[PDB]
């Protein structure tokens, strides 16, 4: 009994932003951290970033300059924010964790 659900735009343009939202139930963002991970066709499962129980965050170095992970504990939502998006950014984005113990459906994202 613990759900994770991504909510994104699906479609976006070549230089625009990206805002995916994770609604979580079954627990409290105050005690567990949440991760963001994307997987594009032709495999390649890459970790994007994380935000722990304490508002501290960690990001993928070769992406650092574009993302950010935020969250509202009282509303149980982790947010994700990228920008300067391009083709490479098309993939499936997931917000997971209990240390990768639980995952969410994911959200597709095609740029252009």
């Amino acid at each position: 009994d613990v759900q994770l659900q991504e909510s994104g735009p699906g479609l976006v343009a070549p230089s625009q932003s990206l805002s995916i939202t994770c609604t979580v139930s079954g627990f409290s963002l105050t005690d567990y951290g949440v991760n963001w991970v994307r997987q594009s066709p032709g495999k390649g499962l890459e970790w994007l970033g994380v935000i722990w129980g304490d508002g501290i965050t960690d990001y993928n170095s070769a992406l650092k300059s574009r993302l950010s992970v935020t969250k509202d504990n009282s509303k149980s939502q982790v947010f994700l924010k990228m920008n300067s998006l391009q083709s490479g950014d098309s993939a499936r984005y997931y917000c997971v964790t209990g240390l990768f113990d639980y995952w969410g459906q994911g959200t597709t994202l095609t740029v252009s």
Binding site: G98, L99, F100, Y102
Partner: protein, 110 residues
Amino acid sequence: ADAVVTQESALTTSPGETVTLTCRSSTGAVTTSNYASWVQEKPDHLFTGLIGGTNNRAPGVPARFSGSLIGDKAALTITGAQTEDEAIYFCALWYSNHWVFGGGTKLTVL
């Protein structure tokens, strides 16, 4: 750290058999401080957490699955494989400030 995590590409087994998946680090042996985690991907881009922290089994996961360190690597062992275990398995290894996934292992259960 900017290491590569390696897994066996593919592995074939049979219901009732025992199979062991391993995870290599390009920087040397795999410690318990690498927090080796394993997740399974079932058809329809479905992911399930199996083990996290070297050998802690996520609540609700079958007992046929178990993780450990075996030599310079991390290992996920399915004792008495079953048909529905056919999937792609991944390991994540925690380095100093980031997580790094492996290429994934395609498990075929005939």
